[PDB]
Design a protein around this nucleic acid. Structure first.
Ligand code: NA
Length: 198
DNA sequence: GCGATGGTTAACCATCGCTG
DNA sequence: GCGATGGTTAACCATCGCTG
């Protein structure tokens, strides 16, 4: 189906958009071993975007600093999602552009934890954070992460502990969900979450 | 109608840790 | 000693996608 693996409520964009690839993770299985994906960050002249890619045929195309043109991709609350429905081509020279330094900078920065806490519940969070505590449990792995001004609990709920993380490492989070309500805000894993040592 | 997804509340029980 | 903190499970409420 054209919407296979795409997030609920995502909007199809048929028009081509050219982006420069900044980063991409290795592929990994999710949905209890049934599907694969990888995370990426790309930039246009005006914005950077987090990207979730479900078509493994594209892994070779998501190369650092290369320009690619994407169409029939989806937009899920600002996160670009790309499945087999999309077309991805190498960009024509006359479609390339310079990505402003401030965009590159933004795409690499991590929001302050105190600022993260002010966002709406359900907001997807990405970033690199110092680790204060780590606890491996039967059904979860939890962390206390911190920056210079604040700390927050991270809950990894996926039944799987094969995380490439070593003691002393900073923790890199992809697509965690801010949770709040009555009590302390936390970052909780979701179907697409990925965690690794920096 | 059901599966996937997912935020909130809360019960329950264990462990932690040490004066606002 | 004992209140605070933390893990697990579940109920509840909700939306979407597919139901050609
Ligand atoms: Na996939």
């Amino acid at each position: 189906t054209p919407k296979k693996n795409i997030s609920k409520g995502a909007v199809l964009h048929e028009k081509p958009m050219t982006v420069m690839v900044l980063t991409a993770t290795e592929p990994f299985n999710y949905k209890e071993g049934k599907e694969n994906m990888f995370h990426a960050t790309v930039a246009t002249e005006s914005k950077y975007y987090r990207v979730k890619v479900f078509n493994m045929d594209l892994k070779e195309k998501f190369t650092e600093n290369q320009f690619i043109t994407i169409s029939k991709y989806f937009n899920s609350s600002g996160i670009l999602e790309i499945n087999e429905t999309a077309t991805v081509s190498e960009a024509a020279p006359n479609q390339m552009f310079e990505v402003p330094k401030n965009i590159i900078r933004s795409a690499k920065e991590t929001l302050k934890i105190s600022k993260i806490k002010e966002l709406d519940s359900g907001t997807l969070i990405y970033g690199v954070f110092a680790v204060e505590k780590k606890k491996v449990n039967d059904k979860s792995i939890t962390f206390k992460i911190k920056d210079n001004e604040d700390n927050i609990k991270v809950v990894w709920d996926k039944e799987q502990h094969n995380i490439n993380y070593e003691k002393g490492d900073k923790l890199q989070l992809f697509s965690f969900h801010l949770r709040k309500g009555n009590g302390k805000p936390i970052l909780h894993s979701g179907n697409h979450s990925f965690i690794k040592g920096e």
